[PDB]
Scaffold this active site. Structure first.
Site, PDB file in Angstrom:
ATOM      1  N   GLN A  11       2.291   4.485   6.591  1.00 41.66           N
ATOM      2  CA  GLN A  11       2.226   3.342   7.498  1.00 41.66           C
ATOM      3  C   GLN A  11       0.925   3.368   8.283  1.00 41.66           C
ATOM      4  O   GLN A  11       0.303   2.324   8.505  1.00 41.66           O
ATOM      5  CB  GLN A  11       3.476   3.331   8.403  1.00 41.66           C
ATOM      6  CG  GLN A  11       3.735   2.170   9.438  1.00 41.66           C
ATOM      7  CD  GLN A  11       2.672   1.892  10.507  1.00 41.66           C
ATOM      8  OE1 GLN A  11       1.959   2.789  10.959  1.00 41.66           O
ATOM      9  NE2 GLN A  11       2.556   0.629  10.898  1.00 41.66           N
ATOM     10  N   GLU A  63       7.705   2.552   2.495  1.00 43.63           N
ATOM     11  CA  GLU A  63       8.408   1.548   3.278  1.00 43.63           C
ATOM     12  C   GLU A  63       8.117   0.178   2.685  1.00 43.63           C
ATOM     13  O   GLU A  63       6.944  -0.221   2.624  1.00 43.63           O
ATOM     14  CB  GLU A  63       7.970   1.607   4.742  1.00 43.63           C
ATOM     15  CG  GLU A  63       8.989   1.082   5.744  1.00 43.63           C
ATOM     16  CD  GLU A  63       9.020  -0.433   5.839  1.00 43.63           C
ATOM     17  OE1 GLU A  63       8.012  -1.084   5.491  1.00 43.63           O
ATOM     18  OE2 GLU A  63      10.056  -0.973   6.272  1.00 43.63           O
ATOM     19  N   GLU A 246     -23.733  12.900   1.436  1.00 50.52           N
ATOM     20  CA  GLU A 246     -24.452  13.590   2.504  1.00 50.52           C
ATOM     21  C   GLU A 246     -23.484  14.260   3.460  1.00 50.52           C
ATOM     22  O   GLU A 246     -23.669  15.416   3.814  1.00 50.52           O
ATOM     23  CB  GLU A 246     -25.349  12.651   3.306  1.00 50.52           C
ATOM     24  CG  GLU A 246     -26.497  12.053   2.567  1.00 50.52           C
ATOM     25  CD  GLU A 246     -27.544  13.037   2.126  1.00 50.52           C
ATOM     26  OE1 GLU A 246     -27.765  14.049   2.818  1.00 50.52           O
ATOM     27  OE2 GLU A 246     -28.142  12.785   1.059  1.00 50.52           O
TER      28      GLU A 246
END
Ligand SMILES: Nc1nc2c(ncn2[C@@H]2O[C@H](COP(=O)(O)OP(=O)(O)OP(=O)(O)O)[C@@H](O)[C@H]2O)c(=O)[nH]1
Ligand SMILES: Nc1nc2c(ncn2[C@@H]2O[C@H](COP(=O)(O)OP(=O)(O)O)[C@@H](O)[C@H]2O)c(=O)[nH]1
Ligand SMILES: Nc1nc2c(ncn2[C@@H]2O[C@H](COP(=O)(O)OP(=O)(O)O)[C@@H](O)[C@H]2O)c(=O)[nH]1
Ligand SMILES: [Mg+2]
Ligand SMILES: [Mg+2]
EC number: 3.6.5.-
Lengths: 432, 98, 427, 252, 426
Positions: A11, A63, A246
């Protein structure tokens, strides 16, 4: 053609991804259905013979109603409606539920999608992993995902913006069980882990932006700003462009240190940026302050070890070099002896784009900081203390062991966490 | 809060001109010929050390014989400070054959 | 007709060539399209030492622009003087060494070197006779340094007798832009000393001063600074391009300066530099040029000549100029401060003079000197790199890429030898 | 600490000296007229020269008539990248050729029909009779010819990889074209009939036998918008019939 | 007045012919209809070679188009330059071969050879000195692999002095299009090793590589591939159609390129092949023409010569100024690269020159090469054939139409022989 894939878990991952991909459709001109000189949407968006720019990412959650809300909200036609992955039953804030039963039944469908997204890409540079660090889906299903894409895909860069649980305030009750067990698995299979909290941005939304009652939506924007400032050296042209590996190779000195800390400097309101001089000195000096830092931890207690300053906008290299020099000659910013350079500069050519009617403003120049410090051992010793209190009670183990997971995995969750704290103290010592 | 805050957001397009203002501050393209330029602008200045010394026979509008000793300073300059740059540059008809 | 092939390595090298090939084009007379609209015949005769001839007049340059990322290789292709470089003399990969000397030299940078040597052999044998190679890069990255040192070791192997100019961009003392900087610097210097004949050191910090303290701008940038770097490079090989009163080459340069086959680190400089406020206010004459020639403030590296001692010193002059005044005054600066000049060399200065200055200039010159002030440059890199190698930091980004541990401690051994080589002529 | 121009705080004088030299370089170049805009705004205006075509007395097309070339709308949805239509041939400098969403004559799109074998200025153009298209450039006062050579490895179209169509000042057999009826079961019988004005015709080459195709799915970008690409190729449907993409209108 | 009769067989050959007859229709300047709307007079001087003549200025091409099924020929008829071919020289049957050399060489194929041989007799006798016939096929099919070789056999039986040149598209190394291609080829070389005076191996894989590495081209089509074969089909017969300094016909090239009898497979290659954005950046001088026509990347076949040793080399250079730089830069090559040139033959290059430049280019060149590296081509074809005959795969198809298994082994023999015969001369 230098795409990096973004994978959002849980979530927390999908909700900060809505803010992360609002701005992507905002900054690159992408009207929120899919259609519309310079720049590169090919780094983060797709193409087709109808002009449409598919958001090449995957949102996975256990969910159903959050993803169903995405399919019924604003970005219906934008997202491609089988690369949004959802399940019928949630992990209910458990590690083993998201690791040994719910994860197994849905991982093959996720890995199928990321196959057909990697095949169309010829310049796959790395992975963006947006997961909750103390939840159910973001602790269990992330761990399976890290186990599988680290083995199958070989040596690629894997950067995660883990939603570190706040030290004092917390939402869960079983957070130190979920937190410790997921950073056990992701210790050996990650490249940098950028921790962010939720209470700190609530403070920044109060003191700097003058709007009260802050919600999660006003929080995920600043997370979205940081990810945009990181990735826009690939989306856009710049004076000293800084690619994705990087941070991977030039911020971490040892394989078990990769826990850097993020800070976004110019937090300001709409009624204050017409109203204040942005200066290159005032923006990067305030970025070193402990009071506006995205995890509640004092860097004065520890020593900085490597740092990376990302500049974005009307910025000259000289004002970077002059301001980074007066930081170097400051006594209160304690700095490690054996890593004397400790800095990186990245320049982009744009003001950061501003969300509609938001709490931020059209700043012409921005500074993003990614610094790793041995003071973060204090943040992990607190979770060490909370694990010690709750495991000596034998508390709430039966939810975990009763779901296939061996109880003895609670043990090696700790001695490796003991050594990781011990490894942070040993790199934590001056050499003479 | 998802539906309320996330709006289809018409009308507003982000600024693209400010890309190219910072592009040119860093590049400095109209400034490249102002860096090492000195004294006055001059399109034609070069000449060889043979053509002016053996073929052009030195500077024509200058004083051919008159060598004044100046009222102030200890120097016979109107042969030295002349610095012959007269006429066209070194050119003898090879751009014609190329 | 002696031939120079120019090489660019990485984002630093491409931006140098982006700001160098405009200087030669505006000086020789080449337009953005390649067609020679010159103003005189004495630019076209030696158009051979640079841009190659192709039908229609197009004088296509002779430069292998290389880069491990598809980022800056585009900036050039799409700019003022971009449509001039053969659209194949551009070898661009897609990965990117990523500020690492390892994968830029051994794993990812070693796949592109076959594509460069296929290009270098293609256009260096079409010339009548090759005078030598030249290359510009930065020691600070993984692309200019990693693949630049592999390419320089290759092109030395098949062509040993050729002369070689390399313009390294050495680290700055005070402000560095890379945390792994003394790793990419020391292990590049090891590959640089037995594979070069002459090396100029360029500093990012030392050239920031000149555009603020001499040229006096509040906003000096890379574009305003690479013009200074390109000024001396167009200022070194002038006698190859133009005639003059005392002509030299890259070898009369080379023999007079470096005495021993390891001590070839020089002091680049450019004499006629002043602010735009002193435009019509200054007499561009030899006493106003040679006095600023030897000053430490007009030096394109972080070295001070006042703490060290010169070995050999050198200059080429341009423009229509008598030179008894650069034979007296170059003798005065040789004699006024004998503390800064070496005793066992009787004549330290060399002189050479061209006849054409750059366009916009009436009489210019450049600077070169072998000095023991490169000692403080290399020991600063040495003290910075050994302070991190003792704690074994960032090795796994250098060890897991197919590189053994042993060439790390050989890298410090070679540079500790070279600093001792400049120790014996300190006084 | 960082005040702007016209305020004398710290290195003000050299910043002011930046102002005049830049200014003087402008003002010198301004009143002479070598800016990009004033060089380009006169390139626009003489190409986009407002003028009027030659209206036909009958519905038929005579020689010497300054005519338009327009490709109409189509329900073609094979590729859903689709410039909305009514595309007209136009000047394309960087000289190339392209379509444009223009219906009114603007000068760079007007084409004069010239005579290849005919001699009189007034006579009806007929199907299957060779003719050459002509256009005058902006301030050039010299006739261009619509030409297309064969397809090789050196000279071909920009976006599509088929045979191109280009402009030359030279005269040859490479710049002559003939008209055809769009109904192949009735094309041969209409050889002796002259061409109506606002009707569908096919324009094919005579040294090449490839028609003027009007590729829409590829977009060319110049100083006048997205403009598609025109080339030379015959497109045939399952029932060998020239495809919508090949028709043209000699609207006047 | 020497003339070259064209014999395109199979879909592949009818698509290589579509382009060749359009390329040779520009060189001479013949428009689709068949008239001459050209310019120079050296364009209609030697049209006799690849062009007949009828009413007025009609020039009907001397070509007998062949295909077992009537679909590929139909495409040609209704194409850009299809109303130029005589409708009668289009010999097609009704059924096909189904990628079966058996059918093409034994069944549906010997039932057409009669009608094809009739036209190749009405277009050969209808001419005086015939330099020789010429065939364009694709060893790896049925019409092109079988009928192609059935014709190549019955034309050498009646005209046994004319030059039998063939441009065969040998099966590619990796690129596999037909699955029963090992067999078709292995069974169609035994014929092309004893019934041709000059065969060319033009693999499609090499073609894609010259349209990718040399001629940077994102999307190569079969037309680009066909253009690269036609260009190298007009240079070998160039000194017969245009004036020259050192002329060279199709025999004065074999004579000095086929060392001993058997060996007769040649690797072709063009010269002025540059990109489109890199077209105005390269000076087209003789130096910058030999460098590419000898570089292995250009070889239009898939057998890098470095792995072998050129027994002979040719160079039908086309262009004006070319009489001292040509030789000086042709002995140079034989001197630097000195291990890729046999020693039992002193000079190894046959220089030629056609003072008429290919439209557009100022100078071109075509290199016919007989490296012993062609011994690789056959080697792979055999390694694969032997892999299927072992577990008798597909044999049923071939053995049925009418073919003992001995034939197959006999074929592997002739082939394996050629490879060893080559190896010795190396
Ligand atoms: N900073 C921030 N934290 C969040 C956000 N959403 C959730 N969290 C935190 O993450 C923790 C995990 O909550 P969830 O993400 O809802 O749980 P989950 O990872 O989806 O797993 P399940 O509970 O099984 O659905 C919570 O304790 C929250 O404090 C967010 O949008 N921003
Ligand atoms: N003088 C100068 N130096 C530059 C320029 N651009 C980059 N640099 C230097 O190059 C260093 C970074 O090099 P890097 O980009 O990593 O090189 P790469 O590995 O080849 O890509 C910085 O420390 C700068 O000092 C430029 O335009 N001019
Ligand atoms: N080079 C080239 N090869 C082609 C072309 N068209 C087809 N081919 C090749 O020809 C082969 C097919 O020949 P096929 O149709 O089976 O011969 P047929 O059945 O006897 O007529 C394929 O493997 C293709 O690779 C072309 O235009 N160019
Ligand atoms: Mg959930
Ligand atoms: Mg003869």
């Amino acid at each position: 053609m230098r795409e990096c894939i973004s994978v959002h878990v849980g979530q927390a991952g999908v909700q900060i991804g809505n803010a992360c991909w609002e701005l992507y459709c905002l900054e690159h001109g992408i009207q929120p259905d899919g259609q519309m000189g310079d720049d590169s949407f090919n780094t983060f968006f797709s193409e087709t013979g109808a002009g449409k720019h598919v958001p090449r990412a995957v949102f996975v959650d256990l969910e159903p109603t959050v993803i169903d809300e995405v399919r019924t909200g604003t970005y219906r036609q934008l997202f491609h409606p089988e690369q949004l992955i959802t399940g019928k039953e949630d992990a209910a804030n458990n590690y083993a539920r998201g690791h040994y039963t719910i994860g197994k039944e849905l991982i093959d469908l996720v890995l199928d999608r990321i196959r057909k997204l990697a095949d169309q890409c010829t310049g796959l540079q790395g992975f963006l992993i947006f997961h909750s660090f103390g939840g159910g889906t973001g602790s269990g299903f992330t761990s399976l995902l890290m186990e599988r894409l680290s083995v199958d895909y070989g040596k690629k860069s894997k950067l995660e913006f883990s939603i570190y649980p706040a030290p004092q305030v917390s939402t869960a009750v079983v957070e130190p069980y979920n937190s410790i067990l997921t950073t056990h698995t992701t210790l050996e299979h990650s490249d940098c882990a950028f921790m962010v909290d939720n209470e700190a941005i609530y403070d920044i939304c109060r003191r700097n932006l003058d709007i009260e009652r802050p919600t999660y939506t006003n929080l995920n924007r600043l997370i979205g700003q940081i990810v945009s400032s990181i990735t826009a050296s690939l989306r856009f042209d710049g004076a000293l462009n800084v690619d994705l590996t990087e941070f991977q190779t030039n911020l971490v000195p040892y394989p078990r240190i990769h826990f850097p800390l993020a800070t976004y400097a110019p937090v300001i309101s709409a009624e204050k940026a017409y109203h204040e001089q942005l200066s290159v000195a005032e923006i990067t000096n305030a970025c070193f302050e402990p009071a506006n830092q995205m995890v509640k931890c004092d860097p004065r207690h520890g020593k900085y070890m490597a740092c990376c300053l990302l500049y974005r906008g009307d910025v000259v290299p000289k004002d970077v070099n002059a301001a980074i020099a007066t930081i170097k000659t400051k006594r209160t910013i304690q700095f490690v002896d054996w890593c004397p350079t400790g800095f990186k500069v990245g320049i982009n050519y744009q003001p950061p784009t501003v969300v509609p009617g938001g709490d931020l403003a059209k700043v012409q120049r921005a500074v993003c900081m990614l610094s790793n410090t041995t003071a973060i051992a204090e943040a992990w010793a607190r979770l060490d203390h909370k694990f010690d209190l709750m495991y000596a009670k034998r508390a709430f183990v039966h939810w975990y062991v009763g779901e296939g997971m061996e109880e003895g995995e609670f043990s090696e969750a700790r001695e490796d966490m003991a050594a990781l704290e011990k490894d942070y103290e040993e790199v934590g010592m001056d050499s003479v | 809060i998802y539906r309320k805050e996330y709006v289809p957001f018409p009308g507003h397009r982000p600024d693209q001109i400010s890309r190219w203002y910072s592009k040119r501050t860093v590049e400095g393209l109209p400034y490249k010929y102002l860096i090492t330029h000195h004294q006055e602008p001059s399109q034609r200045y070069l000449i060889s050390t043979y053509d002016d010394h053996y073929n052009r026979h030195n500077y024509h509008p200058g004083l051919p014989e008159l060598r004044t000793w100046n009222r102030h300073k200890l120097l016979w300059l109107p042969e030295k400070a002349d610095f012959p740059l007269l006429g066209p540059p070194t050119n003898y008809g090879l751009y014609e054959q190329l | 007709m002696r031939e120079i092939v120019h090489l660019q390595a990485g984002q630093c090298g491409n931006q140098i060539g982006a700001k160098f090939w405009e200087v030669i084009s505006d000086e020789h007379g080449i337009d953005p399209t390649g067609t020679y609209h010159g103003d005189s015949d004495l630019q076209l005769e030696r158009i051979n030492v640079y841009y190659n001839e192709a039908t229609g007049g197009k004088y296509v340059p002779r430069a292998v622009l290389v880069d491990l990322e598809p980022g800056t290789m585009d900036s050039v292709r799409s700019g003022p003087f971009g449509q001039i470089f053969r659209p194949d003399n551009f070898v661009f990969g897609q990965s990117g060494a990523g500020n690492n000397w390892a994968k830029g030299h051994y794993t990812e940078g070693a796949e592109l070197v076959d594509s460069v040597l296929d290009v270098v052999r293609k256009e260096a044998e079409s010339c009548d006779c090759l005078q030598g190679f030249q290359l510009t890069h930065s020691l600070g990255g993984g692309t200019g340094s990693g693949m630049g040192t592999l390419l320089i070791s290759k092109i030395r192997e098949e062509y040993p007798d050729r002369i070689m100019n390399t313009f390294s961009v050495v680290p700055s003392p005070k402000v560095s832009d890379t945390v792994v900087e003394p790793y990419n610097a020391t292990l590049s210097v090891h590959q640089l000393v037995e594979n070069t004949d002459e090396t100029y050191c360029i500093d990012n910090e030392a050239l920031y001063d000149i555009c603020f303290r001499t040229l006096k701008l509040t906003t000096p940038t890379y574009g305003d600074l690479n013009h200074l770097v390109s000024a001396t490079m167009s200022g070194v090989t002038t006698c190859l391009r133009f005639p003059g009163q005392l002509n030299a080459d890259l070898r009369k340069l080379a023999v007079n300066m470096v005495p021993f086959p390891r001590l070839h680190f020089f002091m680049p400089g450019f004499a006629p530099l002043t602010s735009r406020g002193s435009q019509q206010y200054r007499a561009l004459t030899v006493p106003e040029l040679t006095q600023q020639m030897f000053d430490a403030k007009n030096m394109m590296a972080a070295c001070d000549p006042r703490h060290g001692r010169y070995l050999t010193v050198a200059a080429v002059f341009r423009g229509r100029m008598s030179m008894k005044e650069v034979d007296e005054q170059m003798l005065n600066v040789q004699n006024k401060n004998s503390s800064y000049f070496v005793e066992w060399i009787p004549n330290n200065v060399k002189t050479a003079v061209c006849d054409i200055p750059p366009r916009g200039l009436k009489m210019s010159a450049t600077f070169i000197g072998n000095s023991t002030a490169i000692q403080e440059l290399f020991k600063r890199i040495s003290e910075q790199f050994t302070a991190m190698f003792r704690r074994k930091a960032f090795l796994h980004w250098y060890t897991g890429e197919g590189m053994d541990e042993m060439e790390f401690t050989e890298a410090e051994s070679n540079m500790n030898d070279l600093v001792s080589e400049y120790q014996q002529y300190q006084d | 600490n960082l005040y702007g121009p016209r305020v004398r705080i710290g290195n003000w004088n050299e910043d002011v000296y930046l102002e005049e030299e830049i200014m003087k370089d402008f003002l010198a170049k301004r009143d002479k007229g070598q800016l990009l805009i004033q060089r380009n705004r006169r390139l626009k205006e003489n190409l986009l020269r407002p003028m009027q075509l030659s209206v036909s007395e009958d519905g038929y097309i005579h020689y010497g008539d300054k005519v338009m070339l327009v490709s109409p709308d189509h329900p073609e949805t094979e590729a859903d990248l689709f410039l909305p239509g009514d595309l007209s041939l136009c000047m394309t400098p960087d000289c190339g050729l392209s379509a444009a969403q223009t219906k009114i004559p603007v000068g760079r799109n007007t084409f004069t029909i010239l005579c290849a074998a005919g001699e009189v200025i007034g006579q009806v153009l007929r199907y299957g009779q060779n003719f050459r298209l002509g256009i005058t450039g902006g301030f050039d006062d010299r006739m261009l010819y619509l030409s297309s050579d064969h397809r090789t490895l050196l000279k071909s179209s920009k976006r599509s990889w088929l045979q191109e169509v280009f402009l030359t000042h030279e005269d040859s057999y490479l710049n002559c074209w003939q008209a055809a009826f769009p109904h192949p079961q009735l094309r041969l019988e209409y050889e002796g009939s002259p061409v109506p004005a606002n009707t569908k015709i096919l324009i094919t080459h005579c040294h090449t036998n490839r028609g003027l195709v009007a590729h829409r799915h590829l977009f060319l970008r110049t100083y006048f918008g997205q403009e598609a690409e025109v080339a030379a190729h015959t497109y045939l449907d399952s029932h060998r019939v020239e495809k919508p993409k090949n028709h043209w209108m000699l609207v006047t």
